[PDB]
Amino acid sequence: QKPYKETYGISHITRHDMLQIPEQQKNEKYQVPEFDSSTIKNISSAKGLDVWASWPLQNADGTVANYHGYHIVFALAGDPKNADDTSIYMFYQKVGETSIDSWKNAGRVFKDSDKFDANDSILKDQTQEWSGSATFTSDGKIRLFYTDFSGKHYGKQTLTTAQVNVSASDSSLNINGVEDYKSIFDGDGKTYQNVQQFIDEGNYSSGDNHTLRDPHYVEDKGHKYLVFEANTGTEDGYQGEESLFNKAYYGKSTSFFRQESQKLLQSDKKRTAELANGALGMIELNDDYTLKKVMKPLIASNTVTDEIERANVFKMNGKWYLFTDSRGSKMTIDGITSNDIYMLGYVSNSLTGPYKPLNKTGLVLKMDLDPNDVTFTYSHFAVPQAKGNNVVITSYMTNRGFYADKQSTFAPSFLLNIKGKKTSVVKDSILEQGQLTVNK
Ligand SMILES: [Ca+2]
Asked: Which residues bind Ca(2+)?
């Protein structure tokens, strides 16, 4: 294979940038702060469930919505004893409240029968509900986006939407049901990998890792978009042996390409790297939330990793910020270890790019605690605020199924300062568990 260079007109998480992170991450400005285990509580309304990846009901710009006096948070939850038991529950608090004890449980968004009543071929094969986002429409509706996962069809993941009908009173919120419940996107082969392409490889025992999940709603100039975790397709730089010879994925220089590519080809990570073709994808939606246009990815991570999760994007003080989470254990970069887990971040003058790295390398947050640590956090997510230079970082705390008495729960939130192309964790900015806004 001859060296070549092709960007496919999109941005890229390069080997050179990633290689800088091990030295850089020793700086406290890029570190998830240490939390105090004796302040940590289970979500009391969730009655012995693990509650992990969660997201707020947001306005179109990403700020936290006020639904008839309440904040709403959707979260994956299930039986700690059953790793494949995952559904979306809806929690809520009166605006102004901050304690984890303020979060009431409206129960599951969906009935088991809803996927059948939807008259949706893909939905009737669903076995779990994985993460997404939720927006509060201009006509006052709760518009959910989430990932339909099918264990019966080799882990197919499909971007899916529903309207959640919720009655509000002075005292409680109550889910009456859903409507407009439909598959929107399951990949197209050319831009984003579909499940058949995963099956073509030999599915799980191939080492490939197919993703199409964590859809995030955002608008710009009245146009509606989802930005999501995916993998590339055949026309925007696919996985394969040929991919290791594309200098676009290396960055820096040809000297660096030669050196780094010959090390990678000689390493035990060659096959992993060939399979790695993560992407943060984008589609425009119609006004009824169906698919308008498949768009080019904002960024891809060919060779580095197959798994860039919890896609997030918003405009803040004149610039666009794009984030994703990723485990060091699934990466191929020298010096990044199986303990390292990241939130990576990118910046642009436009929603559709081009995106360049925050803090020169992409590093925004690093968390390297032992999986057994009660204060281990995952699924970090930057929640934009109405004003100022801070966003709020939410995450879940405590690994699923690890401890009988300590379940996955809302992590203490904290502040991340953002200005220009730089971020820093705000010193001693730890808030309540699950707190969504600075303003009370
Ligand atoms: Ca792949």
From this structure: 208, 239, 275, 277, 306
Confirm whether 182 is domain-assigned: yes
Cα(303) to ligand 1 centroid in Å equals 9
Tell how far the Cα of 343 is from the centroid of ligand 1, in angstroms: 20
Answer whether residue 416 is part of any domain: yes
Contacts of the segment 373-379: beta carbons below 8 A, 24+ positions apart: 374/37, 374/40, 374/398, 374/403, 374/406, 375/34, 375/35, 375/36, 375/37, 375/40, 377/32, 377/35, 377/411, 378/52, 378/53, 378/325, 378/341, 379/52, 379/53, 379/54, 379/131, 379/309, 379/310, 379/325
Residue 140 lies in a domain: yes
| CA–CA gap between residue 324 and residue 310 (Å, rounded) | 5
Q: Report d(CA 210, CA 306) in Å as an integer.
A: 8
| Full residue range of the structural domain in which residue 41 is found | 1-434
CATH number, domain of 61, equals 2.115.10.20
Cα 13 to ligand 1 centroid, rounded to whole Å? 15
Ligand 1 centroid – CA 216 distance (Å): 21
Interval between CA 251 and ligand 1 midpoint (Å): 20
Residue 358 CA to residue 366 CA, distance in Å, equals 14
Residue 440 domain-assigned?
Answer: no
Method: X-ray
Q: Single out the residue of 329, 296, 326, 321 nearest to residue 308, CA to CA.
A: 326
Q: Report the C-alpha gap between 147 and 99 in whole angstroms.
A: 29
Distance CA 228, CA 310 (A): 7
